[PDB]
Amino acid sequence: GSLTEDGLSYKEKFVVRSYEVGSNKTATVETIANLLQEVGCNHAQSVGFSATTTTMRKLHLIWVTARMHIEIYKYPAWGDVVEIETWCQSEGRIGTRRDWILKDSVTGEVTGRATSKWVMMNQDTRRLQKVSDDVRDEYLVFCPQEPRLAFPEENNRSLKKIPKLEDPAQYSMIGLKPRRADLDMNQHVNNVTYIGWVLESIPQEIVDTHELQVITLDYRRECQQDDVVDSLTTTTSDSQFLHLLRLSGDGQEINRGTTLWRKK
């Protein structure tokens, strides 16, 4: 892994592992999402972070994911080498954005793209806030100044408003709980686990006959280590689904999302 020539983006190569692939011998969307997180972490490290800045540590502020959007054209096969390029951009005082481009290292063709929105939060009170002048200045020296979008298109899928699933759900997977492998180094549930939980309510027949093309996921509230989740799905249609993750007890919303699948 290394920063590019201008120092405004970062690239890394990965060889797809045996336990990282599903039934079609290609990487799962969760493996892709893990690789995106890893290259994001390596980018932050290369430019002097830890993604907390000096002003963020002084004010006890952290970046939290608000939205993740992934589009895959070809999932890499077991043993294939995939190259991922990542970069960050400031979005005024709303927050920041991290984008990714996935390419087949042998053919050089784009096989996937992703975009994520991050918001500022006080790590103690858990209260969201706007980006201060001081943080925006310390982030700009590591970001491209002109816009650089993984999803440039006017009215693309990554910025669509997602509705709340109405009961009864067509499909469901209940009593989902995180185990220690689902936690990050700070004992918080890893963001990729929520993608897995959303996908658990998709029926196996759809998975066996379709490929996941697009996934958009909103993050509303974190699942704690001792929480239990219900995963709900309804067909809205290619096949499209509307998703909802909520706490099994009180029914508190933790995530909402949509998936688009293509027939194999």
Place this chain on the structure above:
Amino acid sequence: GSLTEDGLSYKEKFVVRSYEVGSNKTATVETIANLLQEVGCNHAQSVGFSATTTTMRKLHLIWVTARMHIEIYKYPAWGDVVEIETWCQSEGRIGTRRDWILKDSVTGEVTGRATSKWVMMNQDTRRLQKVSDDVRDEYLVFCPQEPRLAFPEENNRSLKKIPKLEDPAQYSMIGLKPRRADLDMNQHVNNVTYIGWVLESIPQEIVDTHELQVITLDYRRECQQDDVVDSLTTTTSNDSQFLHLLRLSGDGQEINRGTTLWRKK
């Protein structure tokens, strides 16, 4: 990754990832176990397998894990490079064995070792059997002929008989179920998931104050995709030892039994 000079073992380097580490910023035992499986798979591929031999595919036979034993001296930190060497050995008609050695790539020191026992099974009937002469000869050209043991010692921990936990268990974690990420390419539960399930019944205070030094796990029966598991633990003991049992939540059918040894940080 590459086979060594003599072609009787395989080495591969790994850089420890951000999502692969726990609270201490070092690789979890499950990350180590995944890396062991990956280097094992790369070894099998390099010597012409896919690890069914020609005679195994003809008779619908597969290798299945009977036991896994891991000892860690130092867990590699996030960003560290670890080198793993693996090799196989035939154990007569009982089955085969795969061994591993883990080293810090920078210091060259051994930071861990592992050994696993595999038995032959008919893929369809699920019936265990002995290794035939034709299968034994077919894989001896890929194995060292003289013994090469990751655990050589006279009465070492890797070959100890494990007893069955008696109810009531001191600790328990109930209703554990596999999700799609827990399955391998053939839709079977990955062997590393069982290690995670066993560890779920260890109290968080032990995890926060101790490091896992040794884990020995027996595999009796597989957990199916629609099965639910209960994880049970009882302390048996400076060091803390536990006895473990995984069983199906319904009928109480045994799937795994094991022991863990932990040292104070």
